[PDB]
Each structure stands twice: as structure tokens, then as C-alpha cells.
Amino acid sequence: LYFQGKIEEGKLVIWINGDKGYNGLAEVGKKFEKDTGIKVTVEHPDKLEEKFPQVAATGDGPDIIFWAHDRFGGYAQSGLLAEITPAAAFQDKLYPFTWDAVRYNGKLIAYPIAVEALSLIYNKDLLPNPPKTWEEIPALDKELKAKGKSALMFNLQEPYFTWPLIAADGGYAFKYAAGKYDIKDVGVDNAGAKAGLTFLVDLIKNKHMNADTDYSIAEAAFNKGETAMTINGPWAWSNIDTSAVNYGVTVLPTFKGQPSKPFVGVLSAGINAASPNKELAKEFLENYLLTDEGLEAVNKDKPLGAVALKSYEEELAKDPRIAATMENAQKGEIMPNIPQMSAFWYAVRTAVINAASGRQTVDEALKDAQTAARAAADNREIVMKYIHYKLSQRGYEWDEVVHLTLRQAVDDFSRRYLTPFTARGRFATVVEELFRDGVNWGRIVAFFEFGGVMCVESVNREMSPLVDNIALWMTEYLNRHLHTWIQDNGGWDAFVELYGPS
Incomplete structure (x- = not known):
């Protein structure tokens, strides 16, 4: 279990995307470093939103990650973000709907920073x-x-x-x-x-x-x-x-x-669940960043749009472009932080393109998208129920006919036939080779068998967040690369008719 070692424990390490005001954030960090004597490092790695689930699954990565709130749903599902319970006096400093945006399964999992909408x-x-x-x-x-x-x-x-x-x-x-x-x-x-x-x-x-x-x-x-x-x-x-x-x-x-x-995005600051600097990070966010002077330094570098801090939003909203950003946000909806949103977007993107190009009527395009968005949600449930079953067989606890039919098919298939980084590489290689010469139900059953074995090995090597990463990988592959074949071949009902009792 060498993954339990850490890197740069002595510094407060921050990840934020390169298109934000990270030099302004670094100015806030320099003041924090002077006041506390602890080095602050602001980094803007390319593709940091995809790297974080990999590094944080072994307890590594940055102490604080900045991203739109909706992505934090998948992080909180994997247990990667520290649950926070800030003081009521501090919570009252921010707009209530921004706290709603950083609530997952009834727990606050980040500090809201900024508000943006079209x-x-x-x-x-x-x-x-x-x-x-x-x-x-x-x-x-x-x-x-x-x-x-x-x-x-x-x-x-x-x-x-x-x-x-x-x-x-x-x-x-x-x-x-x-x-x-x-x-x-x-x-x-x-x-x-x-x-x-x-x-x-x-x-x-x-x-x-x-x-x-x-x-x-x-x-x-x-x-x-x-x-x-x-x-x-x-x-x-x-x-x-x-x-x-x-x-x-x-x-x-x-x-x-x-x-x-419009959908509303709330730029938020999550604290790594395995950070050795959680309290320092909380102090940096509450006492330095979420102040008039902290947000101003970031906003000067790159505009945040509206902000979650009431006092500074009132100052920013003297410009009608900020008042308009907040007004459009208030008339819209928080972007849902649920995993079922990714397949919603893929389905609706196809519908608009098909209707706008004339390849489908508005009615057919949206009927397809409605069915696809629902079917992808069903697909996620099939992945989650199977993994929970496979892990229950091994004695690990982890948080209708289709589910019974599939898990017997995998058990039959098994009798006949590790780190987050190496799990991702192995998943991509095995899944590509599995469906290299087409899709069929037998290859889909093998897909579920391979995934469940990897999830058991994950909990054996004491990296349970990797189980959630694998389940997300299986769901995304099912919904983005197997959904079309499944639908055109009769759906899961046809699978049950082939594999279930008649």
C-alpha cells in the first residue's frame, strides 16, 4: 500500500483552471503565506478536473480544487471532498442558493465562490x-x-x-x-x-x-x-x-x-477529503478569499461574473452587466450535480442538431432525447445494482428482473471463462479489445464481469473511492458507446428474453 505516502504536505496546494484569475488568487495566497508562514502554491494543470478523481482516490492531489459546482457531485459520490459545516454567521454572508449548489446527499462539500449564467x-x-x-x-x-x-x-x-x-x-x-x-x-x-x-x-x-x-x-x-x-x-x-x-x-x-x-454554474472551492491541511484550507477560504478584498483580487485578474458573497456582489452589481448576470441566474436553475446530467446533455445536443438541420422534426428529435435520457438513467442503475451485488458477495458494503438476469449471466460467464492510474489504463485497454469486433450481449456480460472484479480488487487494496471511479467509467462507456447498440437490438428487455427463463 505505497499509495498512502504523500507529496508536499508542508504547503497549501490549490488547483484552479487556467481560464480563471489564478494570478489574482495567487495574490491572495501570498498574503496568506505572509500572515501564516505556510507556503501557498496555486497551480493550473491542464485537464485538472479529470486528474482530481485519479490523484484524490489515493489520498493525494491538491488540498483545494476550484471548479463549477456540478462536477463536485461526482467527487462527493467517491468520497473525495471533505464535508464542511461552516458557522451560521459565515453561511449568512453568502446567498442561500449558492449553498444549495454545493450540497450533495444533504451535506455541504465545498465553499461557493462565483455565480455565472448566460x-x-x-x-x-x-x-x-x-x-x-x-x-x-x-x-x-x-x-x-x-x-x-x-x-x-x-x-x-x-x-x-x-x-x-x-x-x-x-x-x-x-x-x-x-x-x-x-x-x-x-x-x-x-x-x-x-x-x-x-x-x-x-x-x-x-x-x-x-x-x-x-x-x-x-x-x-x-x-x-x-x-x-x-x-x-x-x-x-x-x-x-x-x-x-x-x-x-x-x-x-x-x-x-x-x-x-439558463443553467447556473457556481464556481466552488472543495477541500480534499485526505488533505493534511484541511483547517488551513478552511481558514484560507473563509478568512482570505471570501472577502471583499479577496474576491476583488481574483475578479480584477479575470471576471467572476456575479459572486456568492452578498457584500461584494452588491458592489459588483453597480455595473449593469453584473446585475444582469445575477438576474438571469435567478430566473434560471442551478445546474444539477447528479451523474445523470451527462447523458441528458448528449441526448439534447443530438436533438437540437437534428431538428435544426432538418433531419428530424422537433417532435421526433425530442422524443428520442427523452427516451435516451431516461434509458441512460436506467443504465446507471444497472451498473450500481450489479456492483453493489458483486461487492456484497465478498462481504463489502457499498452505497428488477433485469438486475437478477444480468447478475446470473455474469456468474455463468465467470465459471466458463492496482491503482487508480493503472485501473484507468486497464479499463480502457480491456474495454476496447472486448468490443473491437462489434457489440453483442455476450461482450456486454463480459464487460460487467470485468468491471465487478476490478471493483473487488479496489476494496482489497484499500482504495474504495476507486470503486466509484470504475462505476462511473462503466456508466459512461455504456451510455456513450453501447447505448445505440442496446436500443437498436431490443433494449434490456431483449436481453432478459434471451437470458431469463421463459
């Missing part, structure tokens, strides 16, 4: 008074086309950008009720979602937008003054700052009289 960005010279409604955009585009301009260009390829319109009249991902998501209630193909996507498609059919417009095309057009409006977040502001475009930021247009509902 806003309507408009060229003040071209459009001094931007439209309040989606419905008035076609007429506005007609006027601007006569001047060689267009009304609106935003990224149509990623559903993060198109969801605020789809949600406006009633679309939703998973039904959310008092901090809990009903995984069985998906609102992708209801009447409200169809109405929003139909309006988007009509904009393209009537030549007000182009189905091929992506992030690069929309940003280049707006920042060159060719289109009056775009839809984007605070990460895009610095490129417009240095351009000749004089831009404002305002509330998203309404649709059928209802607000556009």
Missing part, C-alpha cells in the same frame, strides 16, 4: 434598446439585414446555449423538488420544450439564424460588429473588451411571456 450581449451602437422578447427578433433581423447586419448569432451546436429558450415554456431536465431530483421525471419532450425548440428551428428556416453557427462563428461576428446580439457568459467579455465593439449585457429575452431559464 446573458443577452448587445452592440450598443447597433442596438441601443435590445428586445425584451424572442418574438420580436425576426422583425428586428429584417431591419438589420437591410443594413448588411443581422440581429442575433449565438452557438447553436451546444445545448447549454439553446436550453434557456427550450426551458422557457416548460422544458426541464430532471424534476427538482426541495433539493431532490426525480430521476424518473424528465421534461425533454413536453409541450413547453417542443414550443421553444420549434421557435429556434423557425428562426433558422426563416433565415434569421444559420444551423451551422457555433461558438467561434458567433463570437467573430459579434466582436466584428456584424450582428447586433449574441448570447454568452462572462468568460467571453475580455475578448469584447479589447475589440472596438461597445457592448452591453442584459436580461435574456422572454418567450411566450416567460423568462429564458
Whole structure:
């Protein structure tokens, strides 16, 4: 068990993405180092959000990781983040919905920092008074086309950008009720979602937008003054700052009289569950970063958008672009921190592209996405129930006909036929070789057998967080590379008919 050794125990080590204000955060760290005598190191490793589950599974990695709250759900599932219970006096300093964003299974698992959502960005010279409604955009585009301009260009390829319109009249991902998501209630193909996507498609059919417009095309057009409006977040502001475009930021247009509902991301600071510096990290976050002066140093370097600290948000909101960011966030929804969200996004991305290109009607595209989002949730449950069963056979405790049919098939298959880093490499190699010459039920059963054996070896070598990493890897592979075959071959019902008793 050599993995129990540590690295750089004497320093407070922070990971934050390279597109944030890490030099400003480093300025906060330098003051903390001077005041405490403990070295603070701010690092911005490429792909740190994927490295953290690997390094933290053996008790290593940074003491503090900064990322959008929704990713912390998968971290907290694996037990990688320290549970915090900050004082009520400190909690009252931040907006209540930001604490909601960092709550997983009823436990606070990070400190909220910043708040960001999409806003309507408009060229003040071209459009001094931007439209309040989606419905008035076609007429506005007609006027601007006569001047060689267009009304609106935003990224149509990623559903993060198109969801605020789809949600406006009633679309939703998973039904959310008092901090809990009903995984069985998906609102992708209801009447409200169809109405929003139909309006988007009509904009393209009537030549007000182009189905091929992506992030690069929309940003280049707006920042060159060719289109009056775009839809984007605070990460895009610095490129417009240095351009000749004089831009404002305002509330998203309404649709059928209802607000556009963007998903809200809360940049948050999680503490490594195995950190030897947990209390130092708590002090850095509570007493140095989450102050007016701490957030200002970060915000100066790179804009945070809105912030979770009420006192500094009130100062920042004197600029209407920040007031607009918070207003759009308040009219939207916290990005769900549940693992079932990844397959939701893949399904909705396909639906928008198919409907916008004309390969499917709005009705068929969203019916496919609804079924895919639900079926991927079912797939996750199959993975979790099997792993729990395989681990229960060995005496390890870990937190209907399909489940019984599959676990007998794996037991039959077994009689006939380690670190987080080496588990990831072995998984990729075995899974690729397993399905190298196609997919069939026998290869899927072998897939579950291989995964369950790896999970047992994980708990044997005293690295139980690796079990959750493996279960996530199996779920992602099932939903991203086996879902199409399963559906086209009769689904899990066909598996039961082949393997179960008749």
C-alpha cells in the first residue's frame, strides 16, 4: 500500500483552471503565506478536473480544487471532498442558493465562490434598446439585414446555449423538488420544450439564424460588429473588451411571456477529503478569499461574473452587466450535480442538431432525447445494482428482473471463462479489445464481469473511492458507446428474453 505516502504536505496546494484569475488568487495566497508562514502554491494543470478523481482516490492531489459546482457531485459520490459545516454567521454572508449548489446527499462539500449564467450581449451602437422578447427578433433581423447586419448569432451546436429558450415554456431536465431530483421525471419532450425548440428551428428556416453557427462563428461576428446580439457568459467579455465593439449585457429575452431559464454554474472551492491541511484550507477560504478584498483580487485578474458573497456582489452589481448576470441566474436553475446530467446533455445536443438541420422534426428529435435520457438513467442503475451485488458477495458494503438476469449471466460467464492510474489504463485497454469486433450481449456480460472484479480488487487494496471511479467509467462507456447498440437490438428487455427463463 505505497499509495498512502504523500507529496508536499508542508504547503497549501490549490488547483484552479487556467481560464480563471489564478494570478489574482495567487495574490491572495501570498498574503496568506505572509500572515501564516505556510507556503501557498496555486497551480493550473491542464485537464485538472479529470486528474482530481485519479490523484484524490489515493489520498493525494491538491488540498483545494476550484471548479463549477456540478462536477463536485461526482467527487462527493467517491468520497473525495471533505464535508464542511461552516458557522451560521459565515453561511449568512453568502446567498442561500449558492449553498444549495454545493450540497450533495444533504451535506455541504465545498465553499461557493462565483455565480455565472448566460446573458443577452448587445452592440450598443447597433442596438441601443435590445428586445425584451424572442418574438420580436425576426422583425428586428429584417431591419438589420437591410443594413448588411443581422440581429442575433449565438452557438447553436451546444445545448447549454439553446436550453434557456427550450426551458422557457416548460422544458426541464430532471424534476427538482426541495433539493431532490426525480430521476424518473424528465421534461425533454413536453409541450413547453417542443414550443421553444420549434421557435429556434423557425428562426433558422426563416433565415434569421444559420444551423451551422457555433461558438467561434458567433463570437467573430459579434466582436466584428456584424450582428447586433449574441448570447454568452462572462468568460467571453475580455475578448469584447479589447475589440472596438461597445457592448452591453442584459436580461435574456422572454418567450411566450416567460423568462429564458439558463443553467447556473457556481464556481466552488472543495477541500480534499485526505488533505493534511484541511483547517488551513478552511481558514484560507473563509478568512482570505471570501472577502471583499479577496474576491476583488481574483475578479480584477479575470471576471467572476456575479459572486456568492452578498457584500461584494452588491458592489459588483453597480455595473449593469453584473446585475444582469445575477438576474438571469435567478430566473434560471442551478445546474444539477447528479451523474445523470451527462447523458441528458448528449441526448439534447443530438436533438437540437437534428431538428435544426432538418433531419428530424422537433417532435421526433425530442422524443428520442427523452427516451435516451431516461434509458441512460436506467443504465446507471444497472451498473450500481450489479456492483453493489458483486461487492456484497465478498462481504463489502457499498452505497428488477433485469438486475437478477444480468447478475446470473455474469456468474455463468465467470465459471466458463492496482491503482487508480493503472485501473484507468486497464479499463480502457480491456474495454476496447472486448468490443473491437462489434457489440453483442455476450461482450456486454463480459464487460460487467470485468468491471465487478476490478471493483473487488479496489476494496482489497484499500482504495474504495476507486470503486466509484470504475462505476462511473462503466456508466459512461455504456451510455456513450453501447447505448445505440442496446436500443437498436431490443433494449434490456431483449436481453432478459434471451437470458431469463421463459
